[PDB]
Design a protein around this ligand. Structure first.
Ligand SMILES: Cc1cc2nc3c(=O)[nH]c(=O)nc-3n(C[C@H](O)[C@H](O)[C@H](O)COP(=O)(O)OP(=O)(O)OC[C@H]3O[C@@H](n4cnc5c(N)ncnc54)[C@H](O)[C@@H]3O)c2cc1C
Ligand SMILES: CCCCCCCCCCCCO[C@@H]1O[C@H](CO)[C@@H](O[C@H]2O[C@H](CO)[C@@H](O)[C@H](O)[C@H]2O)[C@H](O)[C@H]1O
Ligand SMILES: Cc1cc2nc3c(=O)[nH]c(=O)nc-3n(C[C@H](O)[C@H](O)[C@H](O)CO)c2cc1C
Ligand SMILES: COC1=C(OC)C(=O)C(C/C=C(/C)CCC=C(C)C)=C(C)C1=O
Ligand code: FES
Ligand code: FES
Ligand code: NA
Ligand code: NA
Lengths: 248, 196, 201, 406, 395, 446
């Protein structure tokens, strides 16, 4: 009796579809906020702003952060919806992408999106620092971080790795607060405007300007971190944009 | 080429059975005998080779975000479409083989009901969504993943046949010792964890 | 009361039966993912059984498998949306295993075996009990892995780590695949020692 | 907006999926009716639609296959010879069927699903089955927990069977109370000790059971049977009481029950060697038929013996019959061992269990105990204890024909 | 005590051979028993054990006098119980130490680990035998010595106790004990530490017993900068091939000396205890892949240009090939499968060494991986034999 | 023609002189019931009965028509039964010269005799029991036939006799037997020898094949594997050369020929040699005043495949052609498992003894170790010349996987085919017993 089977299939299908299509469509706005607010907390963390609770994170982010788009090649701002921009999608899509050469691919990242998104930390209508999102391949996974550079474009206010799959204890110590705290006060560039931040194996001299202690027993992960700041402070990363920041 | 690096990736570096814990129930249940284990594995290879690329066509053409119409993304229908596609294509396979290819049905078609709505098949497509695969790429991934799944289950069957001489304490005999065997197998398959 | 608690140490889906092992091996690194996953499995198993029972007398036998998976797939899709809207952090951690509840042999195993040819309420209770036993395995494995692999329970420090000025060195194998296999294997051994009726021949 | 698309696409995939499956079914799965051949006879060929187990089609036709468990899969009485079809023997089938038997086509019919054409070679005994509803004549209590059942043949003549056979009795749902049971004052006194009348059997649905015959072939007119009442274990009251035996026990003159024809394989060997009989409880039925069959039907001169196990004199029934046969023919002798004689019994003969009385008296000094056929049937405890003794005497399993009735 | 009587049976069978006679055919038996096999393997690693203790102490002394000196060196010695105990018994710690002082210092690192491995590992072996009512077997003697010889000299004792516990229980005892499992027990225990506590069995802080000293090993150095990066910083000298062959390198206690291992390997190979088909297979696999990488070449990976003879003398390859891949129980049982089983080990070791950046060596992972496929190699071999039988061997 | 390399010659001291001499008079003769595989006796005689030469003593319930007849005439003195009333032996005191006679024939008529005629005479005289079937080493069913009968005209067992010495005397009888076998076989008769010249049958049916190398180059199982592989469908018959002589004597003179030539040898044997005896002769009487003092074990057959001759089982077996006497080694040695054995023999090179080539060893019944699980060091593959995987086959036998054992070639094997595997096993497993258990299951299920 195909007549009865079709009635059941259609009747059951319609009720299931209505609930499924209603739940996903109705909940889409709440889901977008949950993901949108998740990243904002990490930016507020590296920015130096203490935020507790979902409401506070949204309030402080909209009051003291300013997403902005930038072109890596020209090192200048570009117009667009900075808040709503998946830079990873741009890197994947050939639309805004560059297949980096082996020599240039110092951080072992396959592509680099043409437009990059930074986060200006406004303070009384005046920028106080730029949070540059950088990423580079580690030993196991691809590691993403936020680097906070002061207005001068050289001093580093802080660093946080918000996504990495390195081995805990050995390579996952990039998220150790003591290691992160060691970055504040360092300089990304030397007097010659060339990258100088160094991840020194076996530790770094106390009071150094561009030296950061390496990860004990995790050379390969530490090498990846050193590679990450080499590329993203170079000509093909934020070197143009950062140089512009130095001179206003 | 790129495809070759993908195939070796989906057999050793990415292992559904041991690295992703997918298809465990049939993996630990049909591992008693090598011959039957070698049988289910082939059916898994066939189902993955058919299921993954077909769901790839549907996803890109229909379920892909914003592809069908501007501002309309039917992504929430992902789970129902993949499972529905796999279930339908397996059942028809059990029918065409039985009617037209008796020997193949008794060799590979018998295991298809086990491969229906199996975790390994669904998990393979699920990763193929969180990863962007071209149709040719999806074919290799589907083929390679099933081949690697066959390697683990066939390897387990060899160990269990060798275990006929084992004297396993009661209470561990059967399921309990099999779980330990799989864990020890997982230890040896972590030798390519760092490979690319 | 006895019926609901039966699938815990008498016909447990993972200890006696081999069902829902894929989740028990992949989301037991933390109790938060193990706890939320088990609640989902109870929500789906109980509800999928309930709906299957109501339309059992009219389901077409030719495509009953499709009709059943549609109910489970619809419910799991709804659960996925809820976890995204709330508990997005946990939802991200579970990754593709929220959708793999559809193929979870526990959900289908009860649906075909019990939800069919049974009354709705008993079939609903059948799902509730099965998830409880399924949850018991996920809690025991999840408890030992999180405690020894990270020194924390539910994210709370219980063993101060030497890195965090503590005294306990975490065990890195507890966060990897083999540990889950060993814990379940030894978990079965303990159960069948206090319940020797479950010993295989 | 998007919900409309979600609803439409959701159904279109399901409708497309089911339509492909349903469309594929018509052009791939053969729905034509199956033809089953029994023994190759054109008339006996059974035509049944695809689906269901083998026993289903056969039961409807004129060929009845014995099934003690009624398709439960753990009885082995559904063994049939499948010349063609039926696929390969299932792994569960090998549990009750040896590997050698598998090569001969011995398959469990209830475990075999009819999904295509097949050929069957059912034996004559399975073919020769007739449904009869005899009218119960006598339901007297032979002992404390044993009754002698007399059956009136409906269409005259007598049931055709060999000595030691059984008839599969089926009864409908009924509520029979132990109070309705009628017992003589001699045995009723012992019943009052525990007062089993408080039990009330409630047979919710019809059941099928087997009962060994208690009449040799020449005993035309009455199919004598011996029935033991089934009761919950004394130490485990949480068990349902007798269902079929209780129903049969509740019956009296006038009542009728179906017998579904005779069956059995408990048949003696046609040789010239000594025979040994060890009956217990309901096991006295085959022994009476076998003893009657040999003494008069065959007039065999072979030496015979009988060792019935009983606890008290009131348990011992048919004593007069054995005494007459023993006196009538010297070749046949019988002895009984009292496990626990009553104070009033004042027994002065063999005492204890037969598993030691038999050995210490006859087998121990027997020149060639192996050169004997041991037909045994009794309580499970008797069978287990006796088996160990016989093995310790070097007795081949082929010479031990156990017919445990439970 | 009934339970302790079983243990006394093992002790009596150890000092005195049993007086048992055959109860059926064969009425005469071969002289070899499992006991003699185990002690021959146990004695075969004695040359490597003694050199290892000498090497470990030598490396530690050279690094200590290269980092500290005078009062600082004295304070370092007083801080560590390993150091002054060597001086307490009559061993110098300066740069003029003799072989006795170097050996004595190494003994303070090996003996505690071996004793910890033996006592903790032996407890599990006895517990399983007592509860399950079995006689203790001699397999543990080989397992305990091999496990202690493949760990860094600095390994914490509590980690050593855990490693032997995992190997003995999880890999061998739950399967029924000696002869009834499929995985190499000593390497299973090592893999447990490898993944459980990677910080203590990898890096540049564990392969030399000098406090405060950081030094990479030869395999690590080559992976960084090729053959030219092989340098002993505690002595400032280049690591020559003959240095690795003799064993004047940092590393596991018993692995360093390829020469010492070969001498022991030759004896058990000659005695028939160690399969030469497996050892031959390992060499074939390692050589074929090493030369294949050499021909293919690579401008980014220095491991591509390591020749076969350098693969032989570095890391744990020689120790694994002679004493671990030859474990009869976890290897293949057919002659043909032994060649394949060895080849898979040799290929896998080179693969992990050159392609898996996460780990500089792969002998332990290679053998464990190969153990999983030894039953399959036998399966393919027997099925071929079964086909020959069903054709009446062409007769 | 067929050379074997994977095998082991045990260099046990006391090899026989290889010269036939008259033996000690034998007064007790028996038939061993437990050495016929799958035999359930039906007694045709009670204690005190008088028996003729070839009179039946008992029949087989599970092999109808097979008669086990007396080797001598006299009185039955005891019917020994062991556990579960298993027939151990039927002892007959020798007395008189009465014999059951049979039809005789001329030498030229034997090859043309009818198959049923040959069968009837052999079964009636009891000589049918000389044959054993591969698989299962059972007496062939009377109504059965084989296309391949193997004649073992060689013996590579340690301390064995030289068949050439025995056969040369009975040249006419040995050839007459081959002609009888020529007519009895549906196919060929395979005569397996060591390359030295033997009397040769002139029938094209009888083929001679030479086997060279160590034991088991002389075992019938080895010969079948190389010349006529056996399975469930192909069954071969084996008969030793001395029984072939009896076959020829029976059909030439019409009298049962029960004289046997056995090697009495061993380390504790004063003057090892070949001695004339009778079938089932008492071994206690045969070795009296011939063994050195001490606690010794008398074995019927070889030290590899033989029966301990004590009590009920103290008589010569039907299929045994030698008696070996050794010391019972009960001496516990301090650290003996660790000493360098100049006087210890092994298939491995882990003892000093293997360096002294040509050395002989005073082997005892010592196990040389305790029972342990199998650790396979390749010892099995050194002594097993058949196309098999002994380690996997033996592990199946240890595990009881009868189905697996059949696929690996268990149906081709007898207990004696696994004696060397038992000898070299480090774990001290007894594989002959395990094989018999597996073969019993396969026959019971079939
Ligand atoms: C070939 C054959 C021949 C037989 N011949 C005889 C014969 O001659 N005489 C004879 O008396 N019996 C005979 N039996 C035994 C017969 O099958 C029954 O056991 C007997 O007739 C009692 O029937 P019952 O179902 O009422 O008791 P059963 O239920 O079969 O007895 C089992 C025990 O459990 C109790 N019980 C009752 N219902 C249930 C239930 N639903 N679940 C669990 N326990 C229950 C019973 O009271 C009893 O104590 C024969 C059996 C076979 C197979
Ligand atoms: C008993 C032990 C085993 C005996 C083995 C018999 C010898 C085996 C020889 C293998 C083949 C020759 O092996 C040869 O080794 C030399 C070292 O001198 C390598 O020498 C060099 O070659 C490559 C290019 O080819 C260079 O980039 C690299 O610096 C180095 O590897 C060769 O690449 C390799 O081809
Ligand atoms: C040649 C040889 C090598 C062995 N190698 C090892 C080994 O590497 N690791 C180990 O734990 N045991 C080893 N053993 C001991 C034992 O055989 C092994 O633990 C088995 O796995 C126990 O069944 C060896 C034994 C022999 C004879
Ligand atoms: C015969 O060889 C062996 C021994 O010699 C008698 C042992 O002693 C042990 C065990 C050794 C120790 C120290 C265990 C300590 C703990 C308990 C409970 C006894 C083992 C495994 C062994 O193989
Ligand atoms: S839950 Fe059973 S296969 Fe995944
Ligand atoms: S009817 Fe009982 S097993 Fe088939
Ligand atoms: Na070295
Ligand atoms: Na590497």
């Amino acid at each position: 009796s195909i007549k009865k089977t079709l009635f059941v299939v259609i009747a059951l299908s319609l009720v299931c579809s209505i609930i499924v299509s209603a739940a996903a469509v109705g909940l889409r706005d709440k889901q977008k906020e949950n993901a949108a607010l998740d990243k904002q907390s990490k930016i507020l963390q590296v920015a130096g702003i203490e935020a507790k609770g979902s409401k506070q994170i949204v309030e402080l982010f909209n009051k003291s952060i300013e997403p902005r788009l930038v072109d890596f090649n020209t090192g200048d701002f570009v117009e667009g919806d900075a808040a709503n921009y998946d830079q990873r999608k741009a890197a994947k899509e050939a639309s805004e992408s560059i297949k980096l050469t082996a020599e240039q691919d110092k951080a072992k990242i396959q592509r680099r999106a043409n437009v990059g998104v930074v986060y200006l930390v406004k303070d009384g209508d005046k920028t106080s620092k730029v949070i540059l999102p950088v990423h580079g391949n580690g030993l196991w996974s691809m590691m993403y971080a936020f680097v906070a550079v002061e207005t001068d474009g050289n001093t580093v206010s802080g660093l946080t790795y918000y996504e990495q799959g390195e081995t805990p204890g050995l390579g996952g110590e990039v998220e150790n607060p003591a290691w992160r705290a060691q970055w504040v006060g360092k300089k990304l560039f030397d007097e010659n405007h060339k990258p100088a931040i160094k991840i020194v194996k076996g530790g770094a001299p106390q009071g150094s300007e561009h030296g950061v202690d390496g990860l004990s027993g995790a050379t390969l992960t530490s090498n990846g971190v050193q590679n990450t700041f080499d590329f993203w402070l170079g000509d093909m990363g934020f070197g143009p944009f950062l140089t512009k920041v130095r001179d206003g | 080429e790129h495809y070759i690096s993908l195939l070796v990736k989906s057999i050793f570096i990415e292992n559904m059975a041991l690295s992703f814990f997918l298809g465990m129930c049939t993996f630990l249940a049909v591992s008693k005998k090598v011959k039957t284990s070698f049988g289910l594995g082939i059916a898994v290879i066939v189902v993955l080779t058919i299921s993954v690329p077909v769901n790839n066509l549907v996803y890109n053409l229909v379920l892909k975000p914003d592809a069908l119409v501007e501002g309309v993304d039917l992504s929430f229908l992902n789970f129902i479409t993949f499972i529905g596609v796999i279930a339908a294509l397996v059942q028809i396979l059990e029918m065409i083989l039985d009617r037209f290819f008796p020997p193949l049905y008794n060799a590979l078609g018998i295991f298809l009901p086990l491969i229906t709505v199996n975790c390994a098949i669904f998990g393979g497509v699920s990763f193929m969504v969180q990863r962007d695969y071209s149709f040719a790429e999806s074919v290799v991934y589907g083929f390679g993943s099933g081949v690697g799944w066959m390697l683990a289950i066939v390897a387990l069957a060899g160990i269990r046949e060798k275990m006929k001489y084992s004297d396993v304490p009661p209470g561990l005999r059967g399921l309990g010792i099999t779980f330990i065997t799989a864990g020890l197998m997982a230890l040896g398959f972590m030798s390519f964890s760092g490979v690319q | 009361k006895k019926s609901v608690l039966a699938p815990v140490l008498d016909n447990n889906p993972i200890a006696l039966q081999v069902l829902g092992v894929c989740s028990a091996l992949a989301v037991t690194t933390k109790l938060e993912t193990a706890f939320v996953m088990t609640l989902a499995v109870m929500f789906v198993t109980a509800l999928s059984n309930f709906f299957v029972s109501l339309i059992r007398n009219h389901i077409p036998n030719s495509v009953r498998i499709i009709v059943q998976m549609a109910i489970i797939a619809s419910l799991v899709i709804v659960v996925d949306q809820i976890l995204k809207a709330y508990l997005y952090d946990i939802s991200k951690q579970l990754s593709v295993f929220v959708g793999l509840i559809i193929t979870n042999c526990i959900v289908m195993g009860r649906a075909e075996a019990f939800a069919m040819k049974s009354e709705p309420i008993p079939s609903f209770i059948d799902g509730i009990g099965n998830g409880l036993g399924y949850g018991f395995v996920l809690m025991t494995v999840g408890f030992f892995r999180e405690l020894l692999g990270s020194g924390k329970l539910f994210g709370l420090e219980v063993l101060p780590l030497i890195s965090n000025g503590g005294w306990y060195q975490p065990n890195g194998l507890m966060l990897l695949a083999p540990s889950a296999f060993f814990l379940i294997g030894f978990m079965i051994w303990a159960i069948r020692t206090f319940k020797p009726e479950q010993v295989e021949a | 907006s998007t919900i409309i698309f979600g609803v439409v696409m959701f159904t279109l995939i399901i409708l497309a999926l089911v339509l492909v499956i349903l469309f594929a079914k018509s052009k791939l799965v053969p729905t034509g009716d199956i033809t089953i051949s029994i023994n190759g006879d054109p008339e006996k060929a059974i035509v049944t639609q695809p689906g269901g187990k083998l026993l289903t089609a056969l039961a409807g036709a004129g060929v009845f296959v014995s099934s003690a468990c009624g398709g439960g899969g753990s009885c082995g009485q559904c063994r049939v010879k499948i010349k063609s079809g039926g696929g390969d023997i299932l792994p569960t089938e090998l549990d009750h069927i040896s590997k050698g038997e598998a090569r001969e086509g011995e398959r469990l019919a209830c475990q075999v699903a009819v999904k295509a054409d097949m050929d069957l070679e059912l034996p004559e005994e399975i073919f020769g089955v007739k449904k009869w509803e005899c009218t119960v004549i006598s339901n007297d209590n032979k002992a404390t927990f044993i009754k002698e059942l007399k059956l009136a043949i409906p269409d005259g003549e007598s049931v055709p069977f060999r000595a030691g056979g059984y008839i599969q009795i089926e009864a409908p749902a009924h509520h029979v109370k132990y109070a309705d049971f009628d017992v003589p004052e001699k045995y009723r006194g012992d019943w009052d000790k525990f007062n089993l009348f408080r039990y009330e059997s409630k047979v919710d649905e019809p059941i099928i059971r087997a009962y060994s015959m208690a009449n040799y072939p020449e005993e035309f007119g009455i199919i004598m049977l011996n029935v033991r009442i089934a009761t919950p274990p004394p130490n485990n009251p949480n068990v349902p009481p007798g269902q079929m035996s209780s129903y049969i026990w509740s019956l009296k003159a006038g009542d009728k029950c179906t017998i579904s024809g005779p069956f059995g394989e408990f048949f003696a060997k046609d040789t010239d060697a000594e025979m040994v009989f060890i009956g217990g409880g309901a096991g006295m039925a085959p022994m009476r038929s076998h003893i009657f069959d040999q003494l008069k039907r065959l007039k065999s001169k072979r030496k015979m013996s009988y060792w019935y196990g009983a606890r008290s004199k009131r348990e011992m029934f048919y004593v007069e019959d054995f005494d007459g046969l023993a006196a009538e023919n010297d070749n046949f002798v019988w002895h009984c061992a009292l496990s626990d004689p009553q104070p009033e019994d004042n027994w002065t003969g063999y005492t204890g269990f037969i598993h030691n009385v038999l050995y210490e008296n006859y087998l121990k000094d027997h020149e060639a105990p192996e050169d004997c056929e041991y037909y045994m049937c009794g309580p499970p405890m008797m069978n287990a204890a006796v088996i160990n003794m016989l093995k310790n005497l070097g007795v081949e399993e082929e010479n031990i024909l156990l017919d445990d009735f439970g | 005590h009934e339970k302790w009587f079983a243990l006394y049976e093992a002790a009596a069978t150890l000092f005195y051979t049993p007086g048992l006679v055959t109860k059926r055919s064969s009425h005469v038996r071969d002289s070899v028993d499992l006991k003699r096999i185990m002690i021959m393997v146990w004695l075969a690693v004695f040359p490597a054990m003694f050199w290892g203790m000498y090497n470990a102490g030598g490396q530690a002394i050279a690094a200590l006098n290269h980092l500290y000196s005078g009062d600082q060196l004295a304070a370092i010695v007083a801080g560590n119980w390993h150091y002054w105990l060597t001086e307490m018994l009559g061993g110098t710690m300066s740069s003029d130490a003799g072989w006795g002082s170097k050996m004595l210092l190494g003994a303070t690192y090996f003996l505690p680990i071996y004793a910890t491995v033996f006592i903790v590992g032996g407890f599990w072996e006895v517990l399983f035998c007592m509860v399950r009512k079995h006689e203790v077997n001699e397999g543990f003697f080989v397992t305990s010595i091999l496990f202690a010889l493949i760990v860094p000299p600095t390994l914490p004792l509590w980690q050593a106790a855990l490693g032997i516990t995992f190997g003995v229980v999880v890999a061998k005892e739950v399967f029924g004990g000696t002869g009834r499992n499929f995985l190499n027990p000593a390497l299973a225990g090592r893999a447990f530490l490898f993944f459980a506590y990677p910080a203590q069995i990898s890096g540049d802080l564990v392969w030399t017993a000098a406090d405060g000293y950081s030094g990479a090993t030869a395999l690590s150095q080559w992976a960084q900068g090729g053959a030219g990066a092989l340098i002993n910083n505690a002595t400032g000298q280049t690591i020559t091939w003959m240095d690795a062959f003799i064993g004047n390198i940092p590393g596991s206690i018993g692995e360093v000396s390829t020469l010492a291992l070969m001498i022991g390997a030759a004896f058990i190979v000659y005695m028939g205890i160690a399969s030469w088909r497996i050892i031959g297979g390992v060499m074939i696999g390692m050589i074929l892949l090493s030369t294949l990488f050499n021909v293919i070449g690579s401008d980014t990976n220095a491991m591509f240009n390591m020749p076969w003879h350098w693969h032989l003398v570095l890391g744990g390859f020689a120790f694994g090939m002679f004493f671990m891949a030859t474990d009869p129980v976890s290897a293949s049982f057919t002659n043909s499968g032994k060649w394949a089983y060895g080849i898979l080990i040799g290929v896998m070791c080179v693969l992990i060494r050159v392609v898996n950046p996460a780990y500089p060596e792969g002998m332990m992972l290679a053998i464990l991986f190969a153990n999983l496929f030894a039953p399959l190699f036998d399966h393919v071999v027997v099925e071929r034999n079964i086909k020959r039988r069903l054709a009446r061997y062409g007769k | 023609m067929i050379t074997i390399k994977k095998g082991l010659d045990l260099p046990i001291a006391g090899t026989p002189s290889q010269v036939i001499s008259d033996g000690k008079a034998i007064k007790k003769v028996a038939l061993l019931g437990e050495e016929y595989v799958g035999m359930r006796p039906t007694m045709h005689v009670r204690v005190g009965d008088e028996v003729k030469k070839a009179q039946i003593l008992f029949e087989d319930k599970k092999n109808p028509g097979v008669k086990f007849t007396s080797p001598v005439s006299g009185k039955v003195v005891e019917i020994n039964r062991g556990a579960k009333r298993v027939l151990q032996s039927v002892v007959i005191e020798v007395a008189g010269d009465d014999q059951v006679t049979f039809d005789k024939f001329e030498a030229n008529q034997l090859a043309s005799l009818n198959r049923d005629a040959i069968k009837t005479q052999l079964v009636e005289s009891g000589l049918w029991t000389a044959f054993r079937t591969r698989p299962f080493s059972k007496v062939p069913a009377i109504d059965s036939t084989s296309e391949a009968i193997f004649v073992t005209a060689m013996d590579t067992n340690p301390l064995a006799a030289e068949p050439t010495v025995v056969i040369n005397e009975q040249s006419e009888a040995f050839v007459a037997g081959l002609d009888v076998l020529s007519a009895l076989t549906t196919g060929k008769v395979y005569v397996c020898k060591k390359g030295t010249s033997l009397p040769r049958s002139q029938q094209p049916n009888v083929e001679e094949h030479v086997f060279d190398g160590p034991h088991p180059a002389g075992l019938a199982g080895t010969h079948m594997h190389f010349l006529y592989p056996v399975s469930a469908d192909h069954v071969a018959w084996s008969i030793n050369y001395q029984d072939v002589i009896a076959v020829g004597q029976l059909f030439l003179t019409g009298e049962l020929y029960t004289q046997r030539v056995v090697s009495l040898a061993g380390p504790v044997v004063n003057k090892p040699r070949l001695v004339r005896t009778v079938m089932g002769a008492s071994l206690e009487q045969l070795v009296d005043s011939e063994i050195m003092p001490g606690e010794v074990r008398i074995i019927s057959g070889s030290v590899l495949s033989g029966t301990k001759a004590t009590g009920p089982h103290a008589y010569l077996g039907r299929y045994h052609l030698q008696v070996s006497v050794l010391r019972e080694g009960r001496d516990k040695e301090l650290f003996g498992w660790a000493m360098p054995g100049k006087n210890k023999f092994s298939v491995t090179r882990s003892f000093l003894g293997h360096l002294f080539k040509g050395q002989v060893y005073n082997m005892t019944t010592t196990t040389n170790g305790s029972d342990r699980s199998m650790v396979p060091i390749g010892n099995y593959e050194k002594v097993m010349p058949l196309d098999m995987e002994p380690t996997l086959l033996l592990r199946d036998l240890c595990a009881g996987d009868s189905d697996s054992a059949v696929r690996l070639g268990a149906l081709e094997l007898d207990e004696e085919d696994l004696a060397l595997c038992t000898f070299v096993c480090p774990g001290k497993y007894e594989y002959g017993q395990l094989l018999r258990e597996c073969l019993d299951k396969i026959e019971k299920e079939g």
